[PDB]
């Protein structure tokens, strides 16, 4: 899409109809007559174009009147009603732009943000921008969080975020135009190597990855028009599911064959029951020939009887003769239609033991994109945020994604080296308890407004807590948190002195010996100026291969390496490095998944905010105080970068409407 | 998520 | 609505296979079974047909006679008639082993020979005779 209509689309916003947000908004519109729906959409989606066309400079409402016509740019009011919710709610004017308006003189209300990670910026700025006090405390030494980027030399490596998955609406598209990105395109050609070091044939390659593919859909169709989604009162995960199907399949092979040499028995039977026939015929035949031999010894002349009984056998010996030869005649028909059904048979396994294994690192791809086991996941929604998924060629941050977290920082009150130990929140207002990583006797005290807080999903799991919350949350508030998954997924940094690999194939797959080791070093990515090699560690493997040493996991590694490449053709590499997520305190496993009893709705009550209760009893209900942002609670974009961006900008939108008023509400 | 996968 | 052409997944089957624990390897057990089962049944009769197959060996031509190919005739000679009366004897009604047997007389010829000579020939008595046995 292109024009106004296109805004919309780059926006995730349709273009000819009234989101649910915009329906709270502006209730007086959308209840109203069909004709003023559509001048407001034109507004909003003209907006939105502006800002889009223009990402480097803030869009004031001055500015946006300026360039609308009649009879658009009648209704003032409706003009700044429309600019100010977008503004609000992070659709026009977020991350790094020029301010035109300078920043209010005097800050209204104070708000604590634990944690500096995007999600964090990205609500820091915002709030910043709606002229409010902003603090962020940060446990590392860095901001970034799950966004890490090893810099030594030239050599870049992400060890955390990595790819932007399309431009087509994302806001990373905006980003990427305020903040210098290296963004190359990813050749998604991925060519796959057997465990002995040699390409799988493109014969297999495809007959492969077609049967996966079918195999997904297969428990789709599980999952939605069978119904299986409850197995035993658990919950029934994408893993069972794909099992279920392959042993359906393996199943109908066997069908196949036991009906087909059940085929065979029956003609086979056939031609018993026609030789048995045909043996007892020739047995007279044999039989009734020495009869008219003995009746030939009657020599003429003869009387009519004796003549008769040589014409008689002779007669009875044509007509057994006759029937032999019909039946000779359906030997052949028969004996041939056997040589028909042995001579093509059906399929002899449904897999074998190196299809399997090729299928194998097919599940491992998936095992990567979730950063979890497929048992894990759930059958119903794994997959829920597809529909949501943006358009457009998969990039990679060349200069490494850090840049930008780092970018979103300037300008911040940022407290590096200080681990939240305890949040407080009541009626009349919030403080949080931090310490020094550093030195852990030294005690901070924060007191606030209200409390961001953009905690990791794994540190919200912790057991023991980590983070103390008084008075402690809300029974539906901890059930989604042990409900929802929290995966982990590692990657291995080989930095050489020299490109042994294909230049031109920026992704090359191992097929691993075992299912259960189907994950392990499965995939390596070709990316950096420099000559870098990363590889995953996904699925059980990730969890398993944290506890083995740097110096090993690099020995795996070149071991694969030189069984592709020539054992004397790959040198040791000058520097590695080793990412271990789930045992990092601050993030305790890498990004969020859909467990097996878990859905996309569970994503929803992570992000609603906590009231406490009043101070004094019969006191009216008071503020909302915490507030959740960051990647684990935003359903439509969860475990990426731009869900976490789009989570604080969401959260910063809320905060403004409940500490400095909606005025575009009325 | 799925989109992540190669 | 339908699942991936040659993939195979029926209500029916899916509850068969995740019935228990090992409910899947036991299906697969029974199928696996029951085709060596069947293949060693196909090997056993192959082996039969074979040897029925050894009996037959020279098939039946040392034991076929010569056509005897002549013209079809009116006139019926007394040897004929006499054929006819010991051929309806032993054959009945069947017109065409009559036939054959005479040698030079059509399937209706035969016919008529029983409407003509029915008194003379008491074909009555004749075929009440064959009925007999
Ligand atoms: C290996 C890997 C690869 C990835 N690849 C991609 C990709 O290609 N594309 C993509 O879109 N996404 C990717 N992601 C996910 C993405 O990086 C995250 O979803 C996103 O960065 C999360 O941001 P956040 O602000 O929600 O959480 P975080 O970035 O984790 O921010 C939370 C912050 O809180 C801090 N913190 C934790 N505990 C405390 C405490 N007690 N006190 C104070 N501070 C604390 C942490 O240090 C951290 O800075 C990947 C993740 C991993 C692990």
């Known amino acids: 899409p292109s024009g106004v209509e296109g805004a919309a689309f780059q926006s995730r916003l349709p273009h000819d109809r009234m989101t649910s947000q915009e329906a709270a908004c502006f209730p007086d519109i959308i209840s109203g007559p069909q004709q003023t729906q559509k001048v407001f959409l034109f507004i909003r989606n003209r907006t939105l174009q502006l800002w889009l066309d223009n990402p480097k400079i803030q869009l004031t409402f001055e500015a946006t009147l300026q360039q609308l016509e009649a009879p658009y740019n009648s209704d003032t009011v409706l003009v700044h009603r429309v600019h100010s919710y977008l503004e609000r709610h992070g659709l026009i004017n977020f991350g790094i732009y020029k301010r035109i308006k300078p920043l209010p003189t005097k800050k209204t209300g104070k708000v604590i943000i634990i944690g500096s990670g995007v999600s964090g910026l990205a609500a820091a700025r915002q709030l910043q921008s709606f002229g409010m006090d902003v603090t962020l405390l940060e446990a590392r030494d860095r901001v970034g969080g799950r966004v890490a980027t090893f810099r030594k030399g030239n050599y870049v490596a992400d060890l955390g975020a990595m790819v932007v998955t399309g431009l087509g609406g994302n806001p990373m598209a905006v980003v990427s135009k305020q903040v210098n990105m290296e963004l190359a395109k990813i050749k998604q050609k991925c060519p796959l190597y057997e465990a002995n070091g040699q390409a799988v044939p493109k014969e297999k390659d495809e007959m492969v990855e077609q049967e996966f593919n079918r195999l997904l859909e297969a428990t789709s169709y599980l999952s939605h028009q069978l119904d299986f989604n ?3 009162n658990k919950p029934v995960s994408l893993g069972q599911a794909l099992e279920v199907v ?34 007892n015929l020739k047995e007279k035949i044999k039989e009734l020939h020495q009869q008219y031999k003995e ?5 003429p002349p003869r009387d009519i009887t004796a003549e008769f009984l040589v014409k008689s056998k002779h007669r009875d010996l044509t007509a057994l003769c006759k029937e032999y030869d019909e039946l000779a005649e359906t030997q052949g028909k028969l004996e041939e239609k056997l040589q028909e059904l042995e001579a093509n048979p059906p399929s002899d396994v449904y897999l074998s033991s190196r299809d399997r294994q090729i299928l194998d690192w097919h599940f491992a791809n998936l ?32 200069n490494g994604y850090s840049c930008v977290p780092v970018a979103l920082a300037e300008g911040l009150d940022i407290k590096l080296n200080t681990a939240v130990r305890q949040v407080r929140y009541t009626a009349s207002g919030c403080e949080v308890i931090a310490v020094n990583t550093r030195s852990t006797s030294q005690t901070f005290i924060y007191k606030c407004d209200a409390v961001l807080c953009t905690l990791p999903l794994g540190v919200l799991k912790q057991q023991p807590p980590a983070v103390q919350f008084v008075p402690p949350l809300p029974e539906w508030k901890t059930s989604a948190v042990q409900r929802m998954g929290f995966g982990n997924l590692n990657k291995v940094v080989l930095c050489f002195d020299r490109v042994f690999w294909d230049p031109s194939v920026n992704l090359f797959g191992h097929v691993g010996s075992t299912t259960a080791s189907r994950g392990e070093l499965f995939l390596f990515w070709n ?20 506890n083995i040493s740097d110096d090993v996991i690099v020995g795996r590694c070149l071991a694969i390496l030189k069984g592709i490449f020539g054992s004397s053709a790959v040198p040791q590499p000058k520097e590695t490095v080793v990412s271990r997520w789930r045992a990092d305190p601050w993030a305790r496993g890498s990004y969020s998944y859909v467990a097996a009893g878990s859905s996309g709705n569970d994503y929803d009550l992570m992000a609603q905010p906590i009231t406490p209760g009043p101070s004094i009893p019969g006191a009216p209900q008071p503020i909302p105080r915490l507030f959740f942002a960051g990647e684990h609670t935003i359903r439509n974009y969860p475990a990426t970068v731009h869900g976490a961006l789009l989570s604080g900008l969401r959260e910063a939108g809320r905060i403004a409407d409940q500490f400095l008023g909606a005025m575009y509400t009325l | 998520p799925r989109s992540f996968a190669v | 609505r339908k699942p991936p ?28 079974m029951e085709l060596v089962s069947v293949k060693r049944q196909i090997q056993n009769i192959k082996q039969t047909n074979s040897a029925l197959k050894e009996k037959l060996d020279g098939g039946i031509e040392p034991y076929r006679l010569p056509e005897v190919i002549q013209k079809c005739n009116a006139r019926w000679t007394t040897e004929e008639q006499l054929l006819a009366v010991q051929a309806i004897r032993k054959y009945g009604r069947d017109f065409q082993a009559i036939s054959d047997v005479i040698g030079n007389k059509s399937v209706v010829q035969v016919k008529n020979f029983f409407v003509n000579y029915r008194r003379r020939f008491n074909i009555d008595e004749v075929l009440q005779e064959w009925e007999a046995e």
């Open chain 1, 527 to 546: 990316l950096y100026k420099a000559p870098i090699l990363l590889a995953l560690v996904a699925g059980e493997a990730a969890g398993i291969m944290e």
């Open chain 1, 295 to 299: 009746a030939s010894e009657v020599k």
């Open chain 3, 5 to 32: 052409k040659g993939m195979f997944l029926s209500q029916e089957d899916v509850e068969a296979v995740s019935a228990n624990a090992t409910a899947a390897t036991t299906v697969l057990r029974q199928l696996d």
């Open chain 1, 230 to 232: 409850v197995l035993n």
């Open chain 1, 367 to 398: 095992e990567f994109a979730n950063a979890t086991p497929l048992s894990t996941l759930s059958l119903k929604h794994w997959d829920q945020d597809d529909d949501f998924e943006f358009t457009g060629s998969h990039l990679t941050v060349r």
């Open chain 1, 246 to 279: 392959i042993q359906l399949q393996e199943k109908h092979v066997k069908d196949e064959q036991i009906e087909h040499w059940k085929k065979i028995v029956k003609t086979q039977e056939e031609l018993k029951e026609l030789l048995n026939k045909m043996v």
